[PDB]
A = this chain, B = another copy of it.
Amino acid sequence: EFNILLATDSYKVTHYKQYPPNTSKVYSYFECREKKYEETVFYGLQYILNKYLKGKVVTKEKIQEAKDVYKEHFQDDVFNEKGWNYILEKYDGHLPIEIKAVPEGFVIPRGNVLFTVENTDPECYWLTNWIETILVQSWYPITVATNSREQKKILAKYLLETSGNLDGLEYKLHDFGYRGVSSQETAGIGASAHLVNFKGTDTVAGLALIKKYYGTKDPVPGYSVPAAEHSTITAWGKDHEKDAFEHIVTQFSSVPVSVVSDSYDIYNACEKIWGEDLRHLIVSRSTQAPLIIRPDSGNPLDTVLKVLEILGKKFPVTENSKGYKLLPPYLRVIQGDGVDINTLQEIVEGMKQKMWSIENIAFGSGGGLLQKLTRDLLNCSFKCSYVVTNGLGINVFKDPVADPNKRSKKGRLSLHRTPAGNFVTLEEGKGDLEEYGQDLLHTVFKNGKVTKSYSFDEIRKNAQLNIEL
């Protein structure tokens, strides 16, 4: 069973001894610190609140277990047993903490307060930053949602330019990252964040997370279709690739089907196998059940373009109203190797240059989508900005001489709409002057209870692109 007393950075165990004496309040905030990725999607806090922070999270057994571990870990007795005892006795083990946050799904420019944390009982001044470690891991669903949305923007721009609309946009980037992330839990969280922006996923863990913690009106938030892997092609033997292809498209003759085509020679597979030997099984397929040819190696741009050129000469191509070339509806292509935000951009720009509509292609992304991201990317960061000592509130901050980018905000914070409709974070408790509208942060957690929740449907709505609006 999870033990919040063992879910912090070791050194925080010692911090209760280091704050100024007579400190009754410690107030901290999270931002994606300023100084590409100019705005971030706030998503994932609700998962953390519900899974780890709510309810009776302190018990006698958990305190003793923590005491036992820390004794050995530090080779010394430092550990605030009395402080944790207090929470257990006075609050039945519920955390005397208040968290206020911008609504999930909201898209906020860098350098704004996204949530704040403070103790609600003076005895628990040390608790605010105890939970920094667990709360800061919200960086991951924020960053996955944000990077996924930025890719959607690229896809939308090029799809609109080359086709004149956005049909199918929400299926143009599929999550292939299940095997490529660091754990089962990470897979579920990351997959859920991608689904804020798209509907295609193979990372099944995401579905159950959304249902349990957020919820959708639809049965599931994400979808997939039958597809081959190299094992299901290569198992037929090197000389029987055609047989494998035929068996697979025939098994799935009435649904869309993706077939990896690069086991031996992608260009041969497209020109001679699909384009000649098995052409009769492709041209007969429904518009709702195309063959999706999947290259999986080589330079992503070069391979995509060469695959399109080969297919364009074996299959009947039209030119759409924008002047771009379009494969017949029963045939499409997906590139799912080496795709990240950089290579996605290069591929669609290259296609546009060669007069191929983005209607022709879809993408899959694995490591690039769910693993190749860090907390540094959006500078997701949690800092103390206000304390009360001897009954006096003081505005606190860091401001390292050698790195102005690491300066933190001062005092009590609030998030507001500007007169032009943008966002501003007010410092030093200036929000109390009420010269702006209402504070956009809402209490989402107080004293062990989740106080405000969002469905996944609401989150999707909040994270919509402008071009969709």
Chain A residues in contact with chain B, CB under 8 A?
Answer: 2, 6-12, 14-15, 17-20, 23, 26, 28, 52, 69, 72-76, 78, 129, 132-134, 136-137, 139-140, 176, 178-186, 189-190, 201-205, 207-208, 219-220, 222-232, 234-238, 240, 243-244, 247-248, 251-252, 255, 258, 262-268, 296-299, 303, 366-367, 371-372, 374-376, 382-384, 387, 389, 394, 396-403, 406, 408
Q: How far, in whole Å, are A375 and B396 apart by their CA atoms in the complex?
A: 41
Complex partner residue of A137 from B20, B182, B252, CB under 8 angstroms: B182
Q: How far is the CB of A440 from chain B (nearest CB, A)?
A: 25
Nearest neighbor of A208 in chain B, beta-carbon distance: B6
Q: Are B205 and A7 closer than 8 Å at their CB atoms?
A: yes
Q: Are A72 and B220 closer than 8 Å at their CB atoms?
A: yes
Across-interface contacts of A222 in B (CB, < 8 A): 73
Going nearest first, the 3 A-B pairs with the smallest beta carbon separation are: A298-B402, A185-B185, A231-B384
Complex partner residue of A383 from B137, B230, B265, B383, CB under 8 angstroms: B230
Q: How far, in whole Å, are A298 and B264 apart by their CA atoms in the complex?
A: 50
Nearest neighbor of A381 in chain B, beta-carbon distance: B179
Per assembly, the copies of the chain total 2
Across-interface contacts of A178 in B (CB, < 8 A): 8-9, 133
Whether A179 contacts B19 in the complex (CB less than 8 A), given A11-B227, A129-B231, A205-B7, comes out as: no
Q: Are A226 and B297 closer than 8 Å at their CB atoms?
A: no
Which residue among A9, A75, A384 has the maximum number of chain B CB atoms within 10 Å of its CB? Answer: A9
Q: Are B19 and A235 closer than 8 Å at their CB atoms?
A: yes
Whether A389 contacts B297 in the complex (CB less than 8 A), given A204-B10, A225-B74, comes out as: no
Q: Are A7 and B182 closer than 8 Å at their CB atoms?
A: no
What would be 10 A-B contacts, judged by CB atoms less than 8 Å apart?
Answer: A10-B203, A11-B228, A73-B207, A73-B224, A76-B255, A133-B179, A180-B375, A234-B384, A238-B397, A297-B400
Q: Are A398 and B137 closer than 8 Å at their CB atoms?
A: no
Across-interface contacts of A10 in B (CB, < 8 A): 201-204, 224
Across-interface contacts of A406 in B (CB, < 8 A): 297
Across-interface contacts of A185 in B (CB, < 8 A): 183-186
Whether A204 contacts B69 in the complex (CB less than 8 A), given A180-B374, A184-B137, A401-B264, comes out as: yes
